[PDB]
A and B are shown apart, each in its own frame.
Chain A
Amino acid sequence: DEISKIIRERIEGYNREVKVVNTGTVLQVGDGIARIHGLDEVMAGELVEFEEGTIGIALNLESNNVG
């Protein structure tokens, strides 16, 4: 019924890493498409670049993830 400070803080710590504002963590890659969890502020057609330098276009924006 109640959450301890340690529990709330622990939960928040995990959230901050993933609620990084400009970035999004790859959910699944395949056949030339990446699905990305996150990226709440991207606009359709905005170039997004992953680690190791590949550049991609966010054609599909969906509530769950961005293709």
Chain B
Amino acid sequence: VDSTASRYASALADVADVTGTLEATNSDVEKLIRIFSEEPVYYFFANPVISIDNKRSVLDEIITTSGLQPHTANFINILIDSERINLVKEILNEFEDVFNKITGTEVAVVTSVVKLENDHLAQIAKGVQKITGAKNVRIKTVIDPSLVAGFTIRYGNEGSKLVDMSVKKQLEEIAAQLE
């Protein structure tokens, strides 16, 4: 994807990569996402009517308490100057996808009714890695009542590529007979 929100996030990651603050910058970006969740805080930055000069002063105070990275404080200042603070939320979310690309980590998300031990995951995370082509795999877990007793892992560029077996066997059987 290449949209304005994605474009900005990619720049932010590239500067971190150059300066070797990828771990350090990522923590700050995660820290920002908590900040901009709040309807009141986001609204203040986003709306055109509040004066830009006031926004910087408030932003500076926020940065100090937060203790953000020197570029990360710039990056928000750049967004504010160039009017794209209305799409901060899209930009922050976009950065996580870019950050995995730079490392070579890949997310997978694996779904069960029942919580599973690391050993099963270790096989899956190794399994997604070879199948992925990954340098590294980072695993995301979710709990679902609806399937049966299996699970489905999703991976790829997006969460596009899903390979599952739990409910799906039942569905396949239902289809199979009608043939």
Contact = CB atoms under 8 A, between A and B. Distances in A.
Interface in B42-69: 43-44, 47-51, 54, 57-58, 61-62, 65-66
B62 A3 contact: yes
B contacts with A: majority SS: helix
A25 B49 contact: yes
Contact of A4 (B38, B41, B43, B65): B65
Contacts of B41: 3, 8, 11
A62 interface: no
A2 B65 contact: yes
A16 to B, nearest CB: 11
A11 B65 contact: no
Given A14-B51, A14-B58, A27-B48, 11 more contacts: A1-B31, A3-B38, A3-B41, A3-B65, A4-B61, A10-B61, A11-B40, A14-B50, A15-B40, A18-B47, A25-B49
Interface of B: 31, 34-35, 38, 40-41, 43-44, 47-51, 54, 57-58, 61-62, 65-66
Contacts of A3: 35, 38, 41, 62, 65
30 contacts: A1-B31, A1-B34, A1-B66, A2-B65, A3-B35, A3-B38, A3-B41, A3-B62, A3-B65, A4-B61, A6-B61, A7-B58, A7-B61, A7-B62, A7-B65, A10-B57, A10-B58, A10-B61, A11-B40, A11-B41, A11-B44, A12-B40, A14-B44, A14-B54, A14-B58, A15-B44, A15-B50, A25-B49, A27-B48, A37-B47
A62 B177 CA distance: 53
Nearest to B65: A4
Interface residues of A, number: 17
Contacts of A6: 61
Nearest to A18: B49
Return the 4 tightest CB-CB contacts between A and B, nearest first: A1-B31, A11-B44, A4-B65, A7-B61
B49 A37 contact: yes
B50 to A, nearest CB: 5
Nearest to A10: B58
